[PDB]
Amino acid sequence: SAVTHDYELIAAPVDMELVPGHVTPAWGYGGQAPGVELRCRQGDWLRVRFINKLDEPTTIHWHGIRLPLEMDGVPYVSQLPVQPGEYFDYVFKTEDAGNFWYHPHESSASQLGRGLVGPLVVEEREPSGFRHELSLSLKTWHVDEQGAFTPFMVPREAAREGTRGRLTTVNARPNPTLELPAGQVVRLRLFNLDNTVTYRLNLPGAEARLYALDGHPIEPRPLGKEYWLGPGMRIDLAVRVPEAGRELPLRNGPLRLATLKSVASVEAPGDWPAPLPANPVAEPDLSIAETLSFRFEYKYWQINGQAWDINDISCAERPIATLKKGGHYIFELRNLAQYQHPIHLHGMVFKVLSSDRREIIPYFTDTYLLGKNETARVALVADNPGVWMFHCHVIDHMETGLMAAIEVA
Positions in the binding site for Cu ion (CB under 5 A): 63, 341, 346, 392, 394, 397
CB 141, min distance to Cu ion, A: 20
Tell me if 330 sits within 8 A of 286, measured CB to CB: yes
- Last residue before each break in the chain (C–N > 2.5 Å): 297
Tell me if 199 sits within 8 A of 287, measured CB to CB: no
Tell me if 142 sits within 8 A of 136, measured CB to CB: no
Nearer to Cu ion among residue 251 and residue 397 (C-beta): 397
d(CA 89, CA 40): 16
Other beta carbons within 10 Å of 206: 19
Nearer to Cu ion among residue 240 and residue 341 (C-beta): 341
Nearer to Cu ion among residue 63 and residue 189 (C-beta): 63
**Alpha-carbon distances of 190 from 171, 173, 213, rounded to whole Å:** 10, 15, 10
CB 68, min distance to Cu ion, A: 14
Task: Give kind and range of the element (H or E) at residue 110.
Answer: helix 108-113
Cis peptide preceding 20, ω within 30 of 0? no
CB 397, min distance to Cu ion, A: 3
Is the four-CA dihedral 365, 407, 389, 7 of positive or negative sign? negative
CB 262, min distance to Cu ion, A: 36
d(CA 231, CA 227): 13
Task: Give kind and range of the element (H or E) at residue 263.
Answer: strand 255-263
CB 399, min distance to Cu ion, A: 10
Output the CA angle 66-31-148, nearest 5 degrees. 105
Would residue 11 be called left, alpha or beta, if left means φ above 0 and alpha means ψ between -120 and 50 degrees?
beta
Nearer to Cu ion among residue 143 and residue 392 (C-beta): 392
Other beta carbons within 10 Å of 77: 21
Burial class from Cβ neighbours inside 10 Å (0-12, 13-18, 19+) for residue 256 reads: middle
CB 106, min distance to Cu ion, A: 13
CB 162, min distance to Cu ion, A: 6
CB 398, min distance to Cu ion, A: 7
Nearer to Cu ion among residue 134 and residue 320 (C-beta): 320
Nearer to Cu ion among residue 251 and residue 341 (C-beta): 341
Question: What 8-state DSSP symbol labels residue 8?
Answer: E
Nearer to Cu ion among residue 63 and residue 139 (C-beta): 63
Nearer to Cu ion among residue 353 and residue 392 (C-beta): 392
Nearer to Cu ion among residue 77 and residue 394 (C-beta): 394
CB 394, min distance to Cu ion, A: 4
